[PDB]
Amino acid sequence: MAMSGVSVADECVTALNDLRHKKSRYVIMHIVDQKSIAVKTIGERGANFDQFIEAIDKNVPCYAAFDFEYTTNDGPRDKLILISWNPDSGAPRTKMLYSSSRDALVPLTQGFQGIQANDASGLDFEEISRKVKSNR
Numbered sequence: 001m002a003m004s005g006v007s008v009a010d011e012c013v014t015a016l017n018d019l020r021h022k023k024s025r026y027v028i029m030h031i032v033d034q035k036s037i038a039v040k041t042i043g044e045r046g047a048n049f050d051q052f053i054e055a056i057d058k059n060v061p062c063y064a065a066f067d068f069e070y071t072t073n074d075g076p077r078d079k080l081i082l083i084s085w086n087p088d089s090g091a092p093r094t095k096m097l098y099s100s101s102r103d104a105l106v107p108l109t110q111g112f113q114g115i116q117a118n119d120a121s122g123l124d125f126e127e128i129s130r131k132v133k134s135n136r
Contacts, residue, residue: 002100005035008108012037016065016108020080026066028056031097058118061086061097063105065112070132079132080112087118 015027026043040062041047041055056062062085069078082105086098098116105114113131117124 001103002096003103004100006031006037006097006101007035007104008037008101011039013108015039015042019065019067020078020112022067022069022078026064028062028064030057030060030062031101034093034097034100037101056085058085058087059090059094061094061101063101063109065109066128068128068132072133072135079135081128081132082109082112082114083122083128084114084116085118085122086116090118 012029015029019025019027024042024044025046027039028041028043029037030040032038041051043066056064063082064085065080065082067078067080069076071077072079084098084102086095088095102114115127115131116122117127121127
């Protein structure tokens with residue numbers, strides 16, 4: 001409920017929109033100029049750890065969406081998860097920007113479990129599978 005300037009760019013909306021249809025795999029975007037959100041590094045199936053870490057930066061507020069199929073309904077099911085980066089021990093502007101963008105990300109990421117977790121706590125594959133498997 002900050003509302004300052006941070007807003008999701010058209011490019012981001014299109015990237016996530018297509019990603020939801022299993023266009024690649026996952027998409028990672030970050031906030032630029034704390035006003036306009038831009039893409040930093042897009043996935044496809046399983047980017048390298050070197051490039052993944054090199055691109056990602058544990059500090060600024062970033063959002064990564066991953067599309068994974070499951071058999072919760074019966075078989076041919078698809079569920080996308082949204083993980084936000086924002087360590088409590090990070091920065092003040094970073095934690096604030098998260099809320100300023102969360103409002104605009106709410107409508108953008110409709111139907112996706114959005115959770116904020118920093119460090120391994122945010123990249124916990126087990127947490128993602130457990131969340132989607134539970135559907136809560």
